[PDB]
Amino acid sequence: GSFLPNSEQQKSVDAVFSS
Amino acid sequence: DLTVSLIPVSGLKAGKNAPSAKIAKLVVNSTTLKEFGVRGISNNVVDSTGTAWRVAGKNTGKEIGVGLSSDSLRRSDSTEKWNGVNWMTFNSNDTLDIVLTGPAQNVTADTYPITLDVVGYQP
């Protein structure tokens, strides 16, 4: 098997805890 | 190529949360790649596969423990190494749950950034 380096992505989101 | 969505969970409330409370859903689709590897990215990753880590609240700086859910981990296809680095792999065209890890956590009201790295894998 092999990883595909050009396909690597970083994704971010905020989890919001409310009172 | 991979189409990646990371969706935050609605209605999260401060205070004592349920064990393994869901906080985000990771969605990875691909027409060309059969699997993907995923790791959490933060200032404190707490296991050797990057599948549990700590995140700090924007307004308070308080840390919570987050990671792939136990059910999501049990769906892994394998753990592979990319130049020696462990990445757990999963089927593309599927979703995974990010949760509050471990026993019940008491979460201070705040916004917590969750960051993941996803990479394609051909088995």
Q: Which of B79, B78, B74 is nearest to B97 (CA)?
A: B74
CB interface of B with A, residues 67-106, below 8 Å? 80, 82, 87
The residue written with tokens 């691909």 in the block is B30
Nearest C-alpha of chain A: how many angstroms from B88?
Answer: 12
The domain of B108 spans 1-123
Q: What is the DSSP string of B47-94?
A: STTS-EEEEE-TTT--EEEEEE-HHHHHT--EEEEETTEEEEEEESSE
Q: What are phi and psi of B20, to 5 degrees?
A: 60, 30
Resolution for this experimental structure (Å): 1.9
Q: Cβ separation of A11 and B107 shorter than 8 Å? A: no
Which residue in chain B is spatially nearest to A10 when comparing CA positions? B117
Q: What are phi and psi of B46, to 5 degrees?
A: -115, 0
Cβ contact B90:A11 at 8 Å: no
Nearest C-alpha of chain A: how many angstroms from B112?
Answer: 5
What is the domain-level CATH number for residue B26?
2.60.40.1570
What's the CA gap between B79 and B102, in Å, rounded?
A: 22
Q: What is the CA radius of gyration of chain B?
A: 14
* B117 C-beta neighbours (distance < 10 Å), count: 15
Domain count, chain B: 1
